[PDB]
Symmetry: D3
Subunit: 292 residues, 6 copies
């Protein structure tokens, strides 16, 4: 029902992209890709087409993906019983091997192949490859005490130079968030915190975080709570109040934007081509976070 | 009235651009710019924004402009009485100096400045600069006899290499169609034939020719005559029948597409952002000419 | 017991490497890595140190790995019952996903990490990444009739240029042999045939094929059958007689050396640092195949 | 009468050029070109040959030209009556358009074509092209009060990098002194002040200012007043005493040499090949200004 | 007595250099340097200044030097008695060592140091260094029988690429004519034949051969015999008639010009700055040889 | 008797080279070459093969050579009687010419030719060529008074950049230690002090100094005095006690290692392939000097 669209309306949608093309040309955009945007075929195919879009505009997308539920599925099919502290599964060496094998050997593969239907762009990588980035073991807090939950950590250091060589070669890196610690022992890294760490280290112009909601509600569930733009100051003050589902997506945006990334975006991964809408439209389809 | 546009319609307009972004990324597009698209301020400002659009997509636009009516105006303000053979003004050395001074020193200037509101892109050039291209004197036919009408000719040879150096540097060349002959004497070149010559020599992916009409009508004025796509074979057979206004715009498309340019486009310069519409929409806003 | 080695013997071992350093400097060496050389920790750690050796000589190693037994293990742990035609497991879409996930997400990972203890060298890749190479479905012969056994094939075409860009950047590619067909459907490729295909396409100076035996015996099990050098002519004539374990390793050497690779080597992966011995010693530790 | 020149005299003239070739090789020389050196055909043809000379020595000439009298002529032929404050014509938007069209579209054109008889060297440019330099509106002083005289100003900022890219490509820039202000409105810039501004910004080794006199007389009209070398200190003290014709040519030399340009030269544009004489002869044909 | 030279005469000498600067810019000139031009201090210092001149014009000089008499002197001071067949000294391994040590270690050194007073330009080389060129043993004819006279030969092959790398780096190669044969045994090469061989292999624009005479006399000693220009056809026919001193200098010019070198020049090394005179003056100071 | 070497011993010798290959890959090694390592043919041929070894590992060797005894021999064959102050021969301009001619024109030549049997690597150079380094006249102390002994000095400044261009081009520089002072007058430089000066200026990873002894004895002639590793602190304190033969070799190591060179090595030039042994074996064959 878009043949029926008069040509002067198509003209104005295209033209409205100009200031965003100009702000992003030759710049890197880190895209955290997860949620339904990763399970419905229409949404995924469109997300892949959009990484190609950016690349065919001379924009440099970097995709960081998660895959928590597919790990648990494979761990269940292998009969690997988990140990849990608080709400956390302990990542034994056995669980890491499965997580790595699932993230890198299955979930990364499907994205690379989708993107590569448009051309020779996607390349899968972890922190292990060429020592592109390292991890540092992180503990969590259960009942306000810090606790070890196995081979889990945060991005420690990033080989910024070698990373930017990959995208100057015209490649879209699909990053599975696994990385060696300083002793060579590979950890699993939360894909949200990692996308923010990669955004900051690569000097990204934008960090996009796909989620399964319209945007951020300041006082959920009040419908009026929805905000389209917000700065780090007010947002950090709202943080110890939001739903548990958005605390990590917000902490990532805070860390990124304060880390120098001009804007981070919490966008609706249920919207087809949500990437194109947030980047090339003034209104967008999510919450834009800036510093202030 | 485009805030009112639902976000999923904006999504589909943007997404439909993908296969054209991919076909044009890193490619040169020669755009012949004339007609009303050059006299109404809204249209011109939009045409300038569109050259910047292409450039901010990693596309390489080259603008060839005419300016026949502004020359006649200046010739009238200078009281330079013309001599006419057939319907042709003889281009004396005096008329060339005015034509060059008007084309290069006024009409080219306004475009360069418009485009350059978006950034350091436009550079004005003639065939004289760096010997970028030469001319060869052409005669016309009045009553079926070939006749001399002064310092007028066709593009003879083009410095393809130096031309492509200019656009690899990220510059949009605004070409005033004046060029030296083999003896150094500068001629004026019809901007339509020149755009086709520059398209062919630069290996352009598309030649766009802005005119003041919807597209080509095969049996004007029959409304049903309008065609959106047509090949060189059928088109060359329609040529000794169309209106006098479109014979040059068609001959250029023939010469270009047969010269290897994959497609030439006769598009409506009265449509705002007509460049964006023909390039990034499947339907377009003109007639597409291919070989066949 | 090598402190006890007199310094003039260490001198002569080192010096004897000179003509091989000279023949290989700046050249690519494809190394097919499998067998025990991939299951005993001492052998694997030494194999990793040797890829670093080559790289620290300005030699360009490319590692192609298999992993048949680890796939069958994982298929067993997942309870995926196989279908068999002849001695062949049918590779359903389900088996491919496991094979890819095991080859790329586990077996490739361990090598990359081993090599990367020496520095930022190893990068895992499949034919899917950047469309580095494609596959073409192959059938097998059961009882002399050609038979379909699922998503299995041969290397079809190789992106030679992009491959050599990777190693000019100083990277050691660890190749998991999975590749998309012309329709995008990923197949599993026998690592032996693939190493020979990659050798030929990259213009490799040598193809090394690690196996679990001293070398090739012409009339096994006669101890006198062992040959240290042999040409394609005599070897192709010996082929329909050897043990079933060596027919693929020999066919690969034939295809490579006839494909222009100056020499292919069937070397003993049970010998620690077997790579260093075959490359930098005149005698070697395997069978050298040349054309003749 | 130069066949009659003995070969050992030709030898010594050539040899005396050596220390100046060495001081200028690979260096930029800004040449302000005006006066009779621009109206007599022998002088102009020789000036063009000399820009080619420099370029065929690996020297990088940059030509800044004026053209005040040709503007007034065209303004008279168009019947554009001027408004005058003091001795200054007000530069209305109409006068700017004529000035730009004359400077860029006629006077620049003739030089480019002359130079280009020797090869593909000359390219005409203004501050508008690629935003190569901007202007800032300047007022003048009539009777010691500062007064607005329209769209006239000084060079504000220069795109040093893009300028030096042009001459590293082997091109001789012919600069028409028109430039946009910070709002995009194009002004006309006095060619003398502009040549000094371009000299300083490009790190020029020398600024040559062609005039219609032997050199600078310190107490004109005393014949003994002529000086061949002088420093900024003494010269700035002589400035509020010289003829009105030389105050701008001197202020330019002061601004340049104090701006870091090692020497500025006021040379006689009535001398054929005056450029060659001042640059490659110890004596020169003008006044050399240094710092002190 | 050149202060007394009016400035308009200095102008015309300089200007007359233009077409030769243009023909030689970026081109290599092989200069065979010998005779008195190598023994009188004024002449040598001027010859060195002239190599710097060429280099400071973006011209690429290559100097090939001889030194026959200084070898005989050193052989006499060492008491090495010679053996002679015909008029030829047999070049024993002992004589080669002296010749190499004199040519490379003394005569080359003085030139390099002279040239390098003007800057970091000269570098001494033989065919031994980087295998820049090889030799092939040549026999001579005594009484019409070909005879061995030791380690003497002709330039066999030249590393054109590595040679042109040296001059693109901005270096003036001072070539001592010694080169290894295919077995590594170094021979001495006649500097005249070698300069012609280096001219041909480097694609030189000109070969200059300094001698101790005005130019070539066709029927010496007739004063009218002197010719300023001559082609290979007529010259080869004059060859079995000239003085013994010029047969090698002519054979070199023939071999070079027929080898594709546009012109070879036999110029008077007794004229100060003879290089500058022949290159940058229309008349020259020698005989110019062209093909015809 | 090295065929008899079991393959697993050859394996371990090769493998033990890995950490040294890694520490030296892409790094420059200055090698001072003198003593018997320069007079016995087996040792010299092996030393040449070893420079090729380094180069075929992507290591950048730079050879500094002496040749004191061959100078005295030639001075004797020429009957040039010397003048002596203390134990020092005065270097008259005559002696310099012989020294330069011997060092550069004979001793350098033989090494270049030896090395070049392995490929196009060696190039002979002095400080005179391209002004690669200068000298400063040095006086010596006879009976504790500083005394002039002619044209002798120390390396003053080094053209680090142009030097490293030579080795990035893949060339092994054979350096004859002669260099011009600031006035252009060439001096002879002690090859030991020069190797240390070149090591420091090029940022060398190691300086190797070949001598005619096992290593450094701290209290010669006590056999127990031999040390395999020692730091600058203890070594400088041992210096005013060692044999006269090693004071210069030690002072060079001190100056180098304190100059930032990570380690200097005094190795036994009587050991065949002593370079390979000290570099690629943990034990070495000399004394390693580090800072401490
Ligand atoms: N307000 C929100 N959440 N989005 O609108 C901003 C989108 C704009 N294209 C940008 O990239 O900044
Ligand atoms: N049918 C016409 N006239 N235009 O539609 C084709 C437009 C398409 N973007 C192209 O560039 O080919
Ligand atoms: N004969 C056998 N199988 N090996 O010896 C040859 C090894 C040699 N380094 C080579 O790389 O050719
Ligand atoms: N004295 C005067 N005015 N000129 O002589 C100096 C000219 C010299 N070639 C230079 O470029 O400095
Ligand atoms: N006629 C003789 N011998 N010389 O005059 C020619 C010189 C000219 N510069 C050239 O380089 O060709
Ligand atoms: N101890 C001595 N003298 N040598 O052993 C050290 C050698 C080691 N390859 C190095 O290059 O440091």
């Amino acid at each position: 029902r878009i043949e029926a669209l008069p040509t002067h309306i198509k003209a104005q949608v295209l033209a409205e992209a100009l200031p965003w093309l100009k702000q992003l040309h030759g710049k890197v955009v880190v895209v955290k890709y997860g949620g339904n945007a990763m399970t419905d075929d229409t949404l995924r195919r469109a997300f892949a087409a959009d990484m190609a879009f950016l690349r065919n505009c001379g924009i440099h997308p970097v995709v960081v993906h998660g895959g928590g539920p597919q790990i648990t599925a494979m761990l269940r099919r292998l009969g690997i019983e988990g140990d849990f502290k608080g709400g956390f599964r302990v990542t034994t060496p056995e669980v890491l091997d499965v997580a790595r094998m699932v993230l890198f050997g299955q979930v990364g593969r499907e994205l690379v192949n989708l993107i590569n239907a448009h051309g020779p762009y996607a390349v899968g990588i972890t922190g292990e490859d060429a020592q592109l980035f390292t991890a540092v073991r992180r503990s969590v807090t259960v009942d306000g005490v810090a606790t070890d939950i196995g081979l889990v950590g945060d991005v420690d250091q990033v080989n910024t130079a070698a990373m930017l060589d990959l995208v100057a070669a015209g490649r879209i890196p699909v990053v599975s968030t696994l990385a060696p610690d300083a002793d060579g022992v590979v950890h699993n890294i939360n894909a949200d915190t990692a996308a923010a760490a990669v955004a900051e280290a690569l000097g990204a112009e934008k960090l996009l975080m796909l989620t399964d909601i319209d945007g951020l509600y300041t006082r959920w569930p009040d419908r009026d709570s929805l905000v389209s733009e917000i700065d780090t100051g007010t947002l950090a003050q709202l943080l110890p109040t939001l739903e548990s589902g958005m605390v990590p997506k917000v902490e990532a945006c805070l860390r990124a934007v304060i880390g120098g990334v001009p804007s981070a975006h919490i966008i609706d991964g249920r919207v087809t081509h949500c990437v194109l809408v947030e980047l090339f439209t003034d209104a967008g389809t999510g919450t834009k976070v800036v510093r202030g």
